Amino acid sequence: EITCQENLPFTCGNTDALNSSSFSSDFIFGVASSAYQIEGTIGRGLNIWDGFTHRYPNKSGPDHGNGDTTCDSFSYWQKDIDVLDELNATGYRFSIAWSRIIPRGKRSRGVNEKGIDYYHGLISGLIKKGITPFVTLFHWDLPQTLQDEYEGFLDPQIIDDFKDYADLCFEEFGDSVKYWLTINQLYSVPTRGYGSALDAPGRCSPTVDPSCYAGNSSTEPYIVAHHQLLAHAKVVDLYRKNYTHQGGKIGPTMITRWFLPYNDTDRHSIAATERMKEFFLGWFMGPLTNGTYPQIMIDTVGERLPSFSPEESNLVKGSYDFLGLNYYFTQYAQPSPNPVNSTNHTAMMDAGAKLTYINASGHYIGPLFEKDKADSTDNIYYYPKGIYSVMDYFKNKYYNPLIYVTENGISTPGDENRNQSMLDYTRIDYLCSHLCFLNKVIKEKDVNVKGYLAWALGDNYEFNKGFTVRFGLSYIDWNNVTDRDLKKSGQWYQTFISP
Amino acid sequence: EITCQENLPFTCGNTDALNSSSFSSDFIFGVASSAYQIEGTIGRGLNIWDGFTHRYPNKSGPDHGNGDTTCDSFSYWQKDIDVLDELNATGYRFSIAWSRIIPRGKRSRGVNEKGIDYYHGLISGLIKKGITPFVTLFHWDLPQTLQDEYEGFLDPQIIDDFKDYADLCFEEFGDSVKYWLTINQLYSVPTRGYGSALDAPGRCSPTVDPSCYAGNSSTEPYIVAHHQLLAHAKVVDLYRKNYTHQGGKIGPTMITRWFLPYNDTDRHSIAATERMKEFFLGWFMGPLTNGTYPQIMIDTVGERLPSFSPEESNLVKGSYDFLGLNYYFTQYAQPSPNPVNSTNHTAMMDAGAKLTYINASGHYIGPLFEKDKADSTDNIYYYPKGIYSVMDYFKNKYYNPLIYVTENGISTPGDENRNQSMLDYTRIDYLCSHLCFLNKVIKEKDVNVKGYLAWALGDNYEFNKGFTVRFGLSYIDWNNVTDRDLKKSGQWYQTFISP
Ligand SMILES: *[C@@H]1O[C@H](CO)[C@@H](O[C@@H]2O[C@H](CO)[C@@H](O[C@@H]3O[C@H](CO[C@H]4O[C@H](CO)[C@@H](O)[C@H](O)[C@@H]4O)[C@@H](O)[C@H](O[C@H]4O[C@H](CO)[C@@H](O)[C@H](O)[C@@H]4O)[C@@H]3O[C@@H]3OC[C@@H](O)[C@H](O)[C@H]3O)[C@H](O)[C@H]2NC(C)=O)[C@H](O[C@@H]2O[C@@H](C)[C@@H](O)[C@@H](O)[C@@H]2O)[C@H]1NC(C)=O
Ligand SMILES: *[C@@H]1O[C@H](CO)[C@@H](O[C@@H]2O[C@H](CO)[C@@H](O[C@@H]3O[C@H](CO[C@H]4O[C@H](CO)[C@@H](O)[C@H](O)[C@@H]4O)[C@@H](O)[C@H](O[C@H]4O[C@H](CO)[C@@H](O)[C@H](O)[C@@H]4O)[C@@H]3O[C@@H]3OC[C@@H](O)[C@H](O)[C@H]3O)[C@H](O)[C@H]2NC(C)=O)[C@H](O[C@@H]2O[C@@H](C)[C@@H](O)[C@@H](O)[C@@H]2O)[C@H]1NC(C)=O
Ligand SMILES: *[C@@H]1O[C@H](CO)[C@@H](O[C@@H]2O[C@H](CO)[C@@H](O[C@@H]3O[C@H](CO)[C@@H](O)[C@H](O)[C@@H]3O[C@@H]3OC[C@@H](O)[C@H](O)[C@H]3O)[C@H](O)[C@H]2NC(C)=O)[C@H](O[C@@H]2O[C@@H](C)[C@@H](O)[C@@H](O)[C@@H]2O)[C@H]1NC(C)=O
Ligand SMILES: *[C@@H]1O[C@H](CO)[C@@H](O[C@@H]2O[C@H](CO)[C@@H](O[C@@H]3O[C@H](CO)[C@@H](O)[C@H](O)[C@@H]3O[C@@H]3OC[C@@H](O)[C@H](O)[C@H]3O)[C@H](O)[C@H]2NC(C)=O)[C@H](O[C@@H]2O[C@@H](C)[C@@H](O)[C@@H](O)[C@@H]2O)[C@H]1NC(C)=O
Ligand SMILES: *[C@@H]1O[C@H](CO)[C@@H](O[C@@H]2O[C@H](CO)[C@@H](O)[C@H](O)[C@H]2NC(C)=O)[C@H](O)[C@H]1NC(C)=O
Ligand SMILES: *[C@@H]1O[C@H](CO)[C@@H](O[C@@H]2O[C@H](CO)[C@@H](O)[C@H](O)[C@H]2NC(C)=O)[C@H](O)[C@H]1NC(C)=O
Ligand SMILES: *[C@@H]1O[C@H](CO)[C@@H](O[C@@H]2O[C@H](CO)[C@@H](O)[C@H](O)[C@H]2NC(C)=O)[C@H](O)[C@H]1NC(C)=O
Ligand SMILES: *[C@@H]1O[C@H](CO)[C@@H](O[C@@H]2O[C@H](CO)[C@@H](O)[C@H](O)[C@H]2NC(C)=O)[C@H](O)[C@H]1NC(C)=O
Ligand SMILES: *[C@@H]1O[C@H](CO)[C@@H](O)[C@H](O)[C@H]1NC(C)=O
Ligand SMILES: *[C@@H]1O[C@H](CO)[C@@H](O)[C@H](O)[C@H]1NC(C)=O
Ligand SMILES: *[C@@H]1O[C@H](CO)[C@@H](O)[C@H](O)[C@H]1NC(C)=O
Ligand SMILES: *[C@@H]1O[C@H](CO)[C@@H](O)[C@H](O)[C@H]1NC(C)=O
Ligand SMILES: *[C@@H]1O[C@H](CO)[C@@H](O)[C@H](O)[C@H]1NC(C)=O
Ligand SMILES: *[C@@H]1O[C@H](CO)[C@@H](O)[C@H](O)[C@H]1NC(C)=O
Ligand SMILES: *[C@@H]1O[C@H](CO)[C@@H](O)[C@H](O)[C@H]1NC(C)=O
Ligand SMILES: *[C@@H]1O[C@H](CO)[C@@H](O)[C@H](O)[C@H]1NC(C)=O
Ligand SMILES: *[C@@H]1O[C@H](CO)[C@@H](O)[C@H](O)[C@H]1NC(C)=O
Ligand SMILES: *[C@@H]1O[C@H](CO)[C@@H](O)[C@H](O)[C@H]1NC(C)=O
Ligand SMILES: *[C@@H]1O[C@H](CO)[C@@H](O)[C@H](O)[C@H]1NC(C)=O
Ligand SMILES: *[C@@H]1O[C@H](CO)[C@@H](O)[C@H](O)[C@H]1NC(C)=O
Ligand SMILES: [Zn+2]
């Protein structure tokens, strides 16, 4: 019988008690990255994260940081491989920058051979060290040209441009890459990119944020989400019809959270909690498992919710071999009004829920996850049991899928000096406590989880935060980015992997 | 009788001997800037100078600098006005960033109202201080979307997108702006952007520079130059047909140089010198004055030189009310082979000339202009008489045009400390020696020159050089960009203007 801790102090950093041998022999352990966050702009065209961070520097991070140079994995990809080799990792998730291989967006405009060569060399280097690549086609970095031609995922033109990009990736890299992710965190671009305008491309209703160049936060999230699902599904169909000889697997990436009632004896909070599951997870998992959006979304969102045709429904339903599930934290849910006629209405209001990290009796859900220095009542707290609850829910609700945990990690402040930054015991605690619950759910609930990739390989540009936080298991000096030095967490993870 | 110095030491920094009163009462004196170089990316979309500097950081400058934040004239435009007011300047040349007012490139995709407001406030502030705006529509910063959709000026689609952009500018700003420049330095994008790939977008033949993503240095410069002329001419026709009520004037910007024979008794060097005038100046001025390219270009370039239809010829011929002439330096010319079958052939080779700053007897043409620390035999030297020779030539060869000198200036090294940087006596010498010759040519040759704008108002991002050189008449601290402090040159220029 497995017992796992939910509160500080944690004792799962002892590899005598928790290590890779606790999991099945074939289980993959590694780390993750994304292209905007690590590569730099050298050698690629411009994408909407370049555009957004440059047009709206205060939205890029408090330091106005961006991905222009970052950790320079364009130059230092071998050093990334070296970290993975030091870890004895068996997996690495990275993304392909669309703008590096097709700078002009549309494949018929030509490819960048040198960009293709960059990923060939990375892939070959990984495989030579026994590391399985997990490759994200689209980690938010849409070529700027496509956003300017037709507003990107706002328009159905995205589907064929994404398909042709993906086809090039399968053609060039699929002989070696056997695990593909289509779109990173399906929920995020619709809501943050087109709802709150916290993320690229930065569209919203005028009264939500007067700096947005255009948008409608009530309608566009739904349009974009719908196009994401269709573009994803078209790529999965292309993969499974035209690249079956490659013997690989493909799936989407979800951001997952668990949700608990703010007041577990209040029917209204219980209802809000179940609505959140539907609106947060079901928005995408309903289509992916059934070809339809959840009924509560149909009912609430009404004419703002697009319909799938019968052909589209069939294309989207079942459009995965596995799910990449990202998991960071859990929220309490309580009811909230949905003012659909307000000029500041957002899609996110349609769930009719307010989310907190403290429940009605004043209980904080778990240890600190992210401090918010401008408003401490907005601090985020984590909840290790949430990974158990999410995986159990996916198994039970969503037809026992094959799952890889494609991100899980925690930040430390960029204000810490290097010695403090390397002494990242809070990261060991977060990672181990989640791994304990992941082992527990696999054993107790028989969830088909076959790997775990911690966020992040190394310090990088963090969307929305610049270089003001660090997520890496290895440390990068922003004054001299060449080295990636394993932190205490990376050293712990090395021991966990090879105990 | 006016006597002007050609060699150090110069004594024209004495405003007792040379000042604004030496020129006609109406003559405009000011300074110049461009949008990529000064504004920053905040509040605008991405353009090909963002793309180029980010994809090819070693081509942005030795420091890998770029226009992301620069002097932040987005925030500090009032401080630019303040410099101009301190100078008692009567003119200011600035550019509109296309990506700030139409981030999606094509006008039908929507405009950025806040971008429009930015230029309205600048323009209104200038006029309130008695400063005449000279506004460049296109200072190289093409929206990235257009380059990615159709490769920008490589394709005739540029013409209508440029026209619709210009129409928006005339509509929004032409009630106040009475001097418009279409395209900055017509020669530069074809040759550097599409020939040598030193400049955005960075296209060339594969053996010219293997880093180029695509291109053909032998053909594309000509295509791009042809489209520039057509796009320019379509905008001038639009202006003069639809905006005549505004009572303003429009013209192109030329980069001018003079050319002297490397050996003034050698017929081959004399011939190369005359070819250079045709290939450098006539490439554009032939079309602008006659609707045809120079015969030597027709003959040499052959099938690589596009033809104008009779309608196009008529549109381009006479498509200016004035010329903005930029002038920095003069070169000696000697013959050079034109290897049209070589895989590394460039359009620039078609002139059949090699350019130097030292003549056959070892004479350097004038004082140092720009030191090249990697190769000192590649140092640039200036030649004050060249402004006289250029203006005389334009009057005689090109039908006595109205001229404004739209740039003239010199750099100092970014390695200098602030006190050295503010003690910019080399800049006084360059500016005064050229102003002396400009007065001389107006008086002696009756060239219709009606203003002079020195490059640059303040230190900025220099194309190709990052922040490794400074051109400003006012100093900017890159650690805190708010202030623009007049250098010795700016203080001199203040006295020259109001002696
Ligand atoms: C998994 O996918 C299944 C589909 O493959 C989902 O089942 C569908 O659920 C639909 C409701 O979401 C349901 O459709 C309703 O059908 C009513 C019956 O119509 C038939 O008989 C009519 C009925 O009197 C007639 O007009 C129709 O022409 C048919 O003959 C119908 O009125 C409904 O329309 C009203 O409600 C929708 C909102 O739900 C409004 O958008 C619409 O304007 C109208 O106001 C609805 O019809 C659907 O209307 C929209 C139109 O685009 C669709 O094509 C039309 O179908 C449908 O019958 C079933 N299909 C079957 C095969 O069962 C299933 O939903 C879950 O299970 C069903 C039983 C129900 O409990 C749902 O609430 C659950 O979500 C999906 N499962 C999951 C887990 O999501
Ligand atoms: C200012 O613009 C003026 C035009 O408005 C320029 O004058 C034109 O100069 C053209 C040469 O560049 C000249 O065209 C040549 O015409 C030859 C005569 O053709 C007529 O009689 C024929 C002759 O036997 C017959 O086939 C034609 O159908 C006509 O009836 C002719 O062969 C020439 O073609 C050969 O040379 C061109 C290269 O120059 C090759 O491209 C072509 O394949 C061929 O090998 C040339 O014809 C032009 O051919 C190209 C085609 O696209 C053009 O439409 C065709 O016209 C033309 O006659 C005159 N036009 C007039 C009205 O004078 C003027 O040029 C300068 O002055 C002229 C006198 C000459 O000295 C030029 O070298 C100078 O540049 C321009 N001025 C300046 C300063 O540039
Ligand atoms: C978790 O949710 C539960 C369920 O909602 C909360 O308990 C409910 O709390 C209500 C007060 O917020 C209680 O109603 C009140 O009852 C007193 C005594 O009769 C009365 O004077 C009030 O006016 C009020 O009555 C309601 O007024 C509004 C009418 O529309 C409605 O019909 C009336 O019910 C309610 O009885 C209680 N329900 C239960 C089943 O206990 C619970 O609140 C926490 O516990 C209750 C017992 C009370 O001590 C609250 O102070 C305390 O906050 C909530 N838990 C937390 C931690 O918020
Ligand atoms: C400025 O250009 C002028 C004109 O080209 C240069 O003068 C010419 O310089 C040529 C040498 O580069 C002289 O030709 C040579 O004459 C000597 C004496 O006969 C002879 O032994 C050589 O072989 C050579 O003759 C040529 O060989 C190649 C044959 O195809 C050709 O037919 C022969 O001419 C040439 O006479 C001279 N022309 C004139 C009109 O003087 C001039 O060069 C400079 O001055 C000359 C006089 C000489 O002192 C050169 O050393 C010196 O460089 C050049 N000025 C500069 C500074 O480069
Ligand atoms: C978001 O787009 C929706 C749909 O176009 C706009 O909502 C509508 O508003 C028009 C004008 O009021 C209404 O007549 C419709 O009844 C509404 N339709 C629905 C589906 O709600 C909403 O004004 C736009 N919001 C913003 C801020 O522009
Ligand atoms: C807030 O969260 C706390 C902690 O999960 C809940 O408290 C638990 O309540 C259960 C059922 O009453 C008790 O058995 C436990 O002993 C309590 N745990 C502790 C740490 O207090 C609490 O019920 C939640 N409040 C609401 C209103 O939902
Ligand atoms: C530049 O484009 C020119 C024109 O397409 C290419 O030049 C031609 O080369 C083809 C193949 O040799 C030739 O048959 C033609 O005779 C040439 N045409 C002319 C007008 O010169 C040139 O190969 C291309 N250069 C590069 C590096 O791709
Ligand atoms: C190189 O440039 C120098 C300077 O312009 C030329 O020298 C002048 O030559 C003229 C005509 O012979 C003499 O009258 C001057 O006195 C010379 N000036 C000085 C400063 O020497 C020289 O002729 C040029 N060389 C060539 C080969 O063209
Ligand atoms: C691995 O952890 C298991 C408990 O899951 C433990 O029994 C085993 O001895 C540990 N391995 C090492 C080498 O410490
Ligand atoms: C940040 O930038 C936007 C312009 O993009 C401006 O609207 C907003 O006021 C600025 N935010 C703060 C908090 O200053
Ligand atoms: C598959 O490849 C063939 C060859 O390009 C193409 O005809 C077919 O449409 C593609 N298939 C998809 C997505 O099924
Ligand atoms: C607009 O929304 C903000 C945040 O969503 C809220 O605090 C404010 O009350 C809203 N105003 C109206 C008019 O509803
Ligand atoms: C930068 O870091 C690398 C790796 O530690 C080191 O070899 C190189 O010398 C350092 N550069 C400077 C300028 O210190
Ligand atoms: C790498 O992991 C394999 C598999 O568990 C193990 O056999 C090998 O010893 C490990 N190597 C190192 C250096 O830890
Ligand atoms: C201006 O320069 C002229 C010579 O061009 C001179 O005569 C005049 O006195 C100077 N003005 C002043 C105020 O020094
Ligand atoms: C600069 O960058 C390019 C890649 O864009 C590379 O091809 C070239 O070798 C580098 N230049 C130098 C001098 O290192
Ligand atoms: C002028 O404006 C009118 C109204 O848009 C348009 O019909 C006409 O084509 C434009 N003219 C140009 C470039 O001449
Ligand atoms: C190619 O050109 C470079 C510079 O243009 C030159 O130095 C080299 O000799 C040329 N090579 C050939 C094959 O002509
Ligand atoms: C930056 O420069 C401005 C103008 O001199 C000054 O007022 C401001 O205090 C300076 N900021 C810092 C942080 O020194
Ligand atoms: C501004 O220039 C005008 C025109 O020459 C002159 O009358 C006025 O005195 C000058 N002002 C200053 C402060 O120099
Ligand atoms: Zn940047």
- Mapped onto helix, strand or coil, the DSSP state of residue A452 is strand
What does each C-alpha distance from B64 to A41, A42, A45, A358, B461 come to in angstroms?
Answer: 11, 10, 16, 47, 11
C-alpha to C-alpha distances, A150 to A347, A426, A427, B108, B149, nearest whole angstrom = 22, 44, 41, 11, 11
Q: Rounded to 5, what percent of chain B is helix, strand, coil?
A: 45, 20, 40
* Residue pair A426/A469 in contact by the 8 Å Cβ criterion: no
Which residues lie across from B250 on neighbouring strands? B180
Nearest alpha carbon, ligand 5 atom 4: A219
Domains (ranges, CATH) in chain B? Answer: 1-499 (3.20.20.80)
CB A365 within 8 A of CB A260: yes
- DSSP for residue A259: E
Number of H helices, E strands in chain A: 19, 16
Contact predicate B472/B458, CB 8 Å: yes
The rounded distance, in Å, linking the Cα atoms of A412 and B27 is: 61
Nearest by CB: B213 against A103, A105, A214: A103
**Ligand 1: does its nearest atom lie under 6 Å from the Cβ of A401?**
no
Report d(CA A79, CA A484) in Å as an integer: 7
The verdict on whether omega for the bond into residue B9 sits within 30 degrees of 0, i.e. cis, is: yes
CA proximity to A252, closest of A235, A277, A268: A235
The whole-angstrom separation of Cα B435 and Cα B441 is: 10
Task: Label the pairing between strands A323-335 and A353-356.
Answer: antiparallel
**Whole-Å CA distances, A428 to A421, A473, B230:** 12, 9, 64
Interface check B54 vs A, CB under 8 A: yes
Solved using: X-ray
- Which residue has its alpha carbon closest to ligand 9 atom 8? A16
Nearest to B171 by CA among B249, B251, B92, B246: B246
Q: How far is ligand 1, taken at its centre, from the CA of residue A189, in Å?
A: 28
Strand partners, B31: B92, B454
Which residue, B256, B130, B117, B235, is CA-closest to B185? B256
The whole-angstrom separation of Cα B330 and Cα B256 is 9
Please tell me whether the peptide bond between A9 and the residue prior to it is cis, using omega within 30 degrees of 0: yes
Residue of chain B minimizing CA distance to A146 = B145
Taking the C-alpha atoms of residue A469 and residue A461, their distance in angstroms, rounded to an integer, is 9
Is-contact B53 B201, C-beta < 8 A? no
- Burial (CB < 10 A; 0-12, 13-18, 19+), residue A163, is middle
Instruction: Report residue B327 as tokens.
Output: 């002038």
Q: Does B107 touch chain A (CB under 8 A)?
A: no
* Residue in B496, B483, B484, B490 with CA at minimum distance from that of residue B425: B490
Strands B253-261 and B249-251: unpaired
In this structure, the strands spanning B402-407 and B448-455 are parallel
In short, whether A360's Cβ falls inside 6 Å of ligand 3 is: yes
Is residue B17 packed enough to be buried (19+ CB in 10 Å), middle (13-18) or exposed (0-12)?
exposed
Residue set of the binding site of A for substrate: 37, 139, 184, 328, 455, 462-463
Positive or negative, the Cα torsion across B24, B26, B29, B32? negative
